[PDB]
Write a protein that binds this ligand. Structure first.
Ligand SMILES: *[C@@H]1O[C@H](CO[C@H]2O[C@H](CO)[C@@H](O)[C@H](O)[C@@H]2O)[C@@H](O[C@@H]2O[C@H](CO)[C@@H](O[C@@H]3O[C@H](CO)[C@@H](O)[C@H](O[C@H]4O[C@H](CO)[C@@H](O)[C@H](O)[C@@H]4O[C@H]4O[C@H](CO)[C@@H](O)[C@H](O)[C@@H]4O)[C@@H]3O)[C@H](O)[C@H]2NC(C)=O)[C@H](O)[C@H]1NC(C)=O
Ligand SMILES: *[C@@H]1O[C@H](CO[C@H]2O[C@H](CO)[C@@H](O)[C@H](O)[C@@H]2O)[C@@H](O[C@@H]2O[C@H](CO)[C@@H](O[C@@H]3O[C@H](CO)[C@@H](O)[C@H](O[C@H]4O[C@H](CO)[C@@H](O)[C@H](O)[C@@H]4O[C@H]4O[C@H](CO)[C@@H](O)[C@H](O)[C@@H]4O)[C@@H]3O)[C@H](O)[C@H]2NC(C)=O)[C@H](O)[C@H]1NC(C)=O
Ligand SMILES: *[C@@H]1O[C@H](CO[C@H]2O[C@H](CO)[C@@H](O)[C@H](O)[C@@H]2O)[C@@H](O[C@@H]2O[C@H](CO)[C@@H](O[C@@H]3O[C@H](CO)[C@@H](O)[C@H](O[C@H]4O[C@H](CO)[C@@H](O)[C@H](O)[C@@H]4O[C@H]4O[C@H](CO)[C@@H](O)[C@H](O)[C@@H]4O)[C@@H]3O)[C@H](O)[C@H]2NC(C)=O)[C@H](O)[C@H]1NC(C)=O
Ligand SMILES: *[C@@H]1O[C@H](CO[C@H]2O[C@H](CO)[C@@H](O)[C@H](O)[C@@H]2O)[C@@H](O[C@@H]2O[C@H](CO)[C@@H](O[C@@H]3O[C@H](CO)[C@@H](O)[C@H](O[C@H]4O[C@H](CO)[C@@H](O)[C@H](O)[C@@H]4O[C@H]4O[C@H](CO)[C@@H](O)[C@H](O)[C@@H]4O)[C@@H]3O)[C@H](O)[C@H]2NC(C)=O)[C@H](O)[C@H]1NC(C)=O
Ligand SMILES: *[C@@H]1O[C@H](CO)[C@@H](O[C@@H]2O[C@H](CO)[C@@H](O)[C@H](O)[C@H]2NC(C)=O)[C@H](O)[C@H]1NC(C)=O
Ligand SMILES: *[C@@H]1O[C@H](CO)[C@@H](O[C@@H]2O[C@H](CO)[C@@H](O)[C@H](O)[C@H]2NC(C)=O)[C@H](O)[C@H]1NC(C)=O
Ligand SMILES: *[C@@H]1O[C@H](CO)[C@@H](O[C@@H]2O[C@H](CO)[C@@H](O)[C@H](O)[C@H]2NC(C)=O)[C@H](O)[C@H]1NC(C)=O
Ligand SMILES: *[C@@H]1O[C@H](CO)[C@@H](O[C@@H]2O[C@H](CO)[C@@H](O)[C@H](O)[C@H]2NC(C)=O)[C@H](O)[C@H]1NC(C)=O
Ligand SMILES: CC(=O)Nc1ccc(C(=O)O)cc1NC(=O)CO
Ligand SMILES: CC(=O)Nc1ccc(C(=O)O)cc1NC(=O)CO
Ligand SMILES: CC(=O)Nc1ccc(C(=O)O)cc1NC(=O)CO
Ligand SMILES: CC(=O)Nc1ccc(C(=O)O)cc1NC(=O)CO
Ligand SMILES: [Ca+2]
Ligand SMILES: [Ca+2]
Ligand SMILES: [Ca+2]
Ligand SMILES: [Ca+2]
Lengths: 388, 388, 388, 388
């Protein structure tokens, strides 16, 4: 085998077509299915798998009550082939309440994180074995992407943070090269608060549209140069803007340079990608809550400040139901590296209160230069038939 | 590996012998088994798998109530090795309420279809990755075979339709060549309404005995020439005729040229194949309802109008119980390409009303030049022990 | 790969050591486990698997009531790796109420039998695909071994019968050579009623200690010469004698030539093997019922009429609980072909009546030249905790 | 493939980072999970698996009542990939109430033990097939490690005992070389009662920190020279001392030469390893009960009598909950052979009495030269939500 060096032009996509869905919640009312959160999908050259931080339990387990909590010593990273639900036969690849896996092209790398918020650790399991580790620097919930890291020629770069939800955090980018961290670079550029990045190969570099829990609705962008370990950062030019909550199309702004300070203290993991001066992106159809999810093309959104010229939209999840976290994921084509996204459909506590558990099912569309109709693929679980 | 080029003489079969059965419904009253419909089986050179459009749920899930509906955003294409039921560990290969998979001889192709009836899309997932897509042309339930497409030297041909259940539809045949649609040809020949075809390799071409929901009981035939992308069509010569409902042996007819207009607005996916001037075929033992299923050889049925000279019959499913959809499937032998069929044994709503769910189990016999007894292999599930 | 030609001296065993056990019944009261019967184990060069004719249902399924019946259209041949129970994820390799599988050394052969007792068929699935078939000759429950057939250089020989439980049957031996039956030879020798043979390689031939439901307690022996397709037959010389029911050690006899007519109309699948003039063998500890199971070495038992000189006995299953069918199975060693056996531990109806189901779990010891203690490994399921 | 010859310098570890956890008990209240005990993990060059002696049942099976008993004919050795719970789809690799598996570098070896305490046997299944066996020598619960044996160049050494819990036992070390026992050597050195050893490669030899149920809290050490089949033994120099029960840090002692006779009649499987004159080790945080588990580095602990100079400690399992057995396990790195440990988290009868079952879940950290925070990863199962 050789390493993934991703040297192929990004495909010229026309929009998004359907790819996977697992009905996990639907099945949960009639099968021993896990109770996960903050999911994502990644693929090795031959096939894809779906990741998710389970709650160390099943929906029918009374151990589901209080599944809202974000970090318990029992959150383990599950890993199935893309399309097969998290049934008792699922492998818990490692202990972690926050993660990121990528496949250098020879084996898998799994940034797994557990422990006290104040003082947590991060295990770097590569090729099944624990190659290195690192500990909490700012002694405050050392976290990472909750999406897949990316590798180019042997080095895989994961951007992690440790600092303060709504406040100045110490974000840095590790260059774990085959399990062992070969270098660490503090965040450069303008960005004011990088959280849970959605990264993707941009030969010869890596680009990340992230989050910003501090004071921006417009998405942060963290560019890592693979050549010299450098870093740069900014924000998306898009005027539409995509985080949640956010202001609203008419009254939202961004200048690619600073946090817009428009309902900013807030967030949800999102994604996006350039293409010429344009920006393929997607956000919740709702601007206050995580309901529904749309995607569209903002002509100019990449290179021109506050552009609100939208186009090619699509309802992935109708507005009348829940959405959630969202990341990106690439797949090498025979001629070009395609772009794909997934959607976390969360159900349970806080929003819906009939139940005492909080799990989620996924949905994944993929770039396509072909044609396509219209639809809305929600979770589908009747909360009234659900356990608890 | 090389591609399947199917250049082998079709075996000279004597009848049909037993091959698989999964008791899915039987097991459903005592196990987390899925709730599928419109099943089929296909095989790559080494082994076979069984497909089925599940209802994004299990029989015990209250989410089973109303499983009668044909298309919900939750229907995903399941895929197991031939013989292992759709238990929670089954992979949902893609989102689709209508499909067709084939294996060019190097990897699998999966025509998956979801979305609004009015405007649906069709994803062409090949080798795990989404290679292309196409959208609804007549803006009316873009559908396909619900059986396996066939490939010769690299090009795989699936015939799809989009138009009007009982009325003129726009049927066309795509030539997806390794995920990407390399050509599309509108239906030629006489045929008046091709629906859910059962196709099979007929080196150097592909032949399809399909359905006809408009005005025929006799089965349509769609021949695709692989050489020039052409098309031709007609109807089976058989006087016995095999759709449902249909008239009845004595009073049924066909002339290989036009819809017989004998209870025609009606249908069920069926299959058949030539052999000299003869026609191996199978239909429900009942001519009004889908109960039971028989097979036999009509001497002349292929090349001579309205032939009712039957022979070599066999009861696969006794008349006293349910049958359903049915397709064909080929398997390369060491010297000849064998012919095989499967039977959808449906249970649940509308017909049986004790329950509120509608699932099905399969049965599959395969051509054989050997000897064989007689039997009847139904579903076997006691509807009185069944959930709901 | 090459074929198994078994040219190695049989190991010089000292007795039997433990190998597998699946606790299937025990697990059945707390898991979706199948309801099988007439089990057996076989191995391909690399590993072993365990076979069993399930009842097309689980113990918790109400579909378990009446699982006593021997042949229903729903009995399918299950196949797991040696040691993993028949859980919903088990593959139903084919439809069959009587079978025999062997592995020529390149792929598997599965003699599967279903259909009407009067007129049943026998599918010969080889390398996943149906290669041939044969139909019922004496129009009376065409059956076979319920153990593994054996192959030498490409030809695999299964001995089947069709005739009359307690009466003259037409037993014959097929020489299915890679799926296709290359020859059939009627039973020769003295034997008066061969039923469900336990066969084993005896380079360059195959030997079978079978059953005799007609008028013998002493076991039949069917030798097949691979060289010329011939056959020969007789009975074991052993005076101890091992079928059930049988007379009793003191008053039991045999002369290697004729049925002893000592409680003969009766049977249970058993096994045994030579070694010089001696005979390794095993029978139920009880001589009327199937309770318990023992093994021992009869010095002379092979070559000398009515020898009752026993030695090296062992209680595999203590007398206070159920046993059942039993077959043999070989395994190639690095220097010699080892001999192994398995024991069907049946539970359920007729004998135990608290329940309405009849399933079984297995136990398997294997030859050993080493040392070993003593024990008793029964089923272990508390019938009072069991479903129904 | 080649054999594992382990010729690499042991890594220079800084402490322990998280690796796996299976939440088995947590899942048991909502899934068909097995009821095991005395677990362990081992890895072949490519990946790891987790072993455990199940109780031939599930927690929901009424067959769980009385799962406290240590040896029943139904205890079978389960084997899953590291991270996937013991769900019905788990393979019972053999019959055994005491075991040890290792992988010579070409295939697996499984020392499985069952039978009467008085007269038990030990099957040596290698490469799937039973290669040899041995019987009970002192006719008293022939037992072994309950951890993984180790192999160097083709010979795998397991140290077994048979004798008297609290009294002089006959411990010996077998040198099973590819299934067949090529030599046996009685225990040499000073050690007074070796029980369930935790062994590890120390090129060109093997070292074992074991137990001592007789009259020591300080751990026994059994060194096996691979070169000449010799043996040597002693006790750890550490003054901290790690068994349970034990005296207490201030008042505990050891001189590397004799049993300390400090609460000695007692035990629990533990582990430890040298590093220069130092000793990496771990024990329960409690000195009377098995609650909690800690690890630390005793500077000098290896080469200097009664050293109590501790350092680098860590709470793996907080003191407020249960721990249990513990073994070691090695993993070859790209440059050095890393050291790892696992912790048996037991739940059920005797200690906790709300329930009638006694199962356990595991936790596994692995050596690391990196950094790491602090945490406590217990079982997590709310005994009040648990079955029975
Ligand atoms: C491909 O296919 C699309 C499908 O797009 C998406 O449509 C779904 C529904 O919106 C969405 O959830 C799914 O995920 C698809 O991706 C084709 O067009 C689209 O489909 C429908 C119908 O054309 C549009 O749906 C809207 O939402 C309501 C529910 O479906 C519907 O009621 C809305 O219509 C109201 O306005 C119409 C005129 O537009 C009017 O006739 C009615 O009055 C109607 O009723 C409301 O209005 C009144 C009060 O305000 C009262 O009558 C009554 O109380 C009621 O509340 C609306 O139609 C969807 O927006 C539409 N267009 C698009 C661009 O998606 C599309 O043909 C094709 N396009 C592409 C690019 O492939
Ligand atoms: C191989 O084996 C076949 C098996 O073929 C199929 O038979 C099953 C039953 O029909 C079918 O479900 C299964 O799937 C097999 O594939 C051998 O022959 C066949 O088997 C039976 C018996 O010979 C035939 O079955 C028919 O269906 C009824 C249920 O089994 C049965 O009652 C029918 O018989 C009535 O007529 C007979 C004479 O034919 C007469 O003796 C009785 O009176 C009987 O009773 C009814 O009639 C009266 C009122 O009308 C009253 O007595 C009473 O009220 C009752 O209702 C009939 O026998 C099946 O048709 C038959 N033939 C064939 C060609 O399949 C076959 O030997 C062999 N063939 C081949 C090609 O391999
Ligand atoms: C290896 O290990 C064997 C184990 O062999 C098998 O023993 C188990 C029990 O029989 C069997 O189920 C398991 O599968 C093993 O494979 C060692 O020896 C064997 O073990 C026991 C004890 O030595 C023998 O068991 C017999 O069965 C009864 C239950 O265990 C037991 O009660 C019987 O003993 C009666 O007789 C003894 C003297 O023999 C006497 O002291 C008592 O009185 C006892 O009690 C009954 O008798 C009276 C009324 O008749 C009353 O006292 C009271 O009411 C009660 O009913 C008997 O001991 C087993 O037979 C024995 N021998 C053998 C050769 O297996 C063996 O050491 C070693 N051998 C080898 C070849 O490896
Ligand atoms: C990396 O991160 C460690 C984490 O180490 C371990 O800490 C967990 C809790 O002990 C453990 O279960 C987990 O597995 C970790 O591996 C960082 O430091 C450690 O964390 C905490 C806080 O610093 C320490 O925990 C102790 O245990 C109690 C529960 O957490 C806590 O209440 C204890 O504190 C009592 O003393 C403090 C001063 O120490 C005082 O402020 C309070 O009064 C407090 O309250 C009790 O005392 C009074 C009565 O006696 C009353 O106030 C009241 O009734 C109450 O009972 C204590 O803090 C843990 O020991 C600590 N240190 C270490 C070295 O682990 C560490 O920063 C970093 N280290 C490394 C090497 O990476
Ligand atoms: C990126 O990876 C590809 C695959 O390793 C490299 O291209 C291959 O190697 C040589 C030199 O380019 C050619 O003969 C092959 O035909 C190439 N493979 C294919 C599929 O075209 C490529 O050089 C790598 N490096 C860069 C910088 O792109
Ligand atoms: C159809 O496929 C077969 C397999 O690729 C082709 O035949 C093989 O290739 C060469 C030329 O025919 C022969 O030496 C081999 O012996 C053939 N294989 C076998 C199993 O016979 C065949 O040419 C393909 N093309 C056509 C048009 O049939
Ligand atoms: C039985 O099978 C074995 C394996 O195919 C044959 O022996 C091998 O082939 C040649 C000729 O004997 C030797 O160089 C190899 O060393 C043999 N293999 C082994 C493992 O010894 C053997 O000839 C076959 N035929 C017969 C009649 O025994
Ligand atoms: C231990 O095992 C290794 C692997 O088999 C042996 O080293 C390899 O073999 C030759 C001779 O040493 C070298 O060319 C290879 O480069 C070695 N492999 C690696 C990865 O370095 C080694 O000799 C074995 N024996 C001993 C005593 O260490
Ligand atoms: C470790 C962890 O709590 N991850 C999260 C997951 C979801 C959410 C969320 O609110 O959906 C938040 C966090 N935490 C943060 O991002 C804090 O800035
Ligand atoms: C997509 C879809 O509804 N497929 C079907 C499946 C079964 C049936 C059926 O009636 O069994 C019908 C359809 N639809 C049509 O064929 C309409 O002409
Ligand atoms: C097909 C079938 O019934 N197999 C059997 C299995 C078990 C038994 C049994 O009685 O255990 C009997 C049979 N049948 C016969 O052997 C009749 O001679
Ligand atoms: C075979 C067996 O009983 N193994 C054990 C497991 C656990 C324990 C235990 O007490 O945790 C004890 C034993 N037995 C012994 O070690 C006797 O010295
Ligand atoms: Ca924000
Ligand atoms: Ca019609
Ligand atoms: Ca008899
Ligand atoms: Ca002790």
């Amino acid at each position: 085998v050789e390493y993934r060096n991703w040297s192929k032009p990004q495909c010229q996509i026309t929009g998004f077509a359907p790819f996977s869905k697992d009905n996990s919640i639907r099945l949960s009312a009639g099968g021993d299915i896990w109770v996960t959160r903050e999911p994502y999908v990644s693929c090795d050259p031959v096939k894809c798998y779906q990741f998710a931080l389970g709650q160390g339990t099943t929906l029918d387990n009374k151990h589901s009550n209080d599944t809202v909590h974000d970090r318990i010593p029992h959150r383990t990273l599950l890993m199935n082939e893309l399309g097969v639900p998290f049934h008792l036969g699922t492998r818990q690849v490692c202990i972690a309440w926050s993660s990121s896996s990528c496949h250098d092209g020879k084996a898998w790398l799994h940034v797994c994180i557990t422990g006290d918020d104040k003082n947590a650790t991060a295990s770097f399991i590569y090729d099944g074995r624990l190659v290195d580790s690192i500990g909490s620097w700012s002694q405050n919930i050392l976290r990472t992407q909750e999406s897949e890291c990316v590798c180019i020629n042997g080095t895989c770069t994961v951007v992690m943070t440790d600092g303060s939800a709504s406040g100045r955090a110490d974000t840095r980018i590790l260059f774990i090269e085959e399990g062992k961290i070969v270098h660490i670079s503090p965040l450069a550029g303008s960005a004011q608060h990088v959280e849970e990045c959605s990264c993707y190969p941009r030969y010869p570099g890596v680009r990340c549209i992230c989050r910003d829990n501090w004071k921006g609705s417009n998405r942060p962008v963290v560019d890592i140069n693979m050549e010299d370990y450098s870093i740069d950062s900014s924000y998306v030019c898009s005027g539409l803007v995509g985080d949640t909550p956010r202001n609203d199309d008419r009254s939202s702004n961004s200048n690619c340079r600073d946090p817009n300070n428009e309902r900013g203290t807030q967030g949800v993991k999102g994604w996006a990608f350039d293409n010429g001066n344009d920006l393929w992106m997607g956000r919740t159809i709702s601007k206050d809550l995580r309901s529904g999810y749309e995607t569209f093309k903002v002509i100019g959104g990449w290179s021109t400040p506050n552009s609100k010229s939208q186009i090619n939209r699509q309802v992935i999840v109708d507005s009348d139901n829940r959405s959630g976290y969202s990341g990106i994921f690439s797949v090498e084509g025979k001629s070009c590296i395609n772009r794909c996204f997934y959607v976390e459909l969360i159900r349970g506590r806080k929003q819906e209160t009939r139940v005492w558990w909080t799990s989620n099912s996924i949905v994944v569309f993929c770039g396509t230069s072909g044609t396509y109709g219209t639809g809305s693929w929600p979770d589908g679980a009747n909360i009234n038939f659900m356990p608890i």
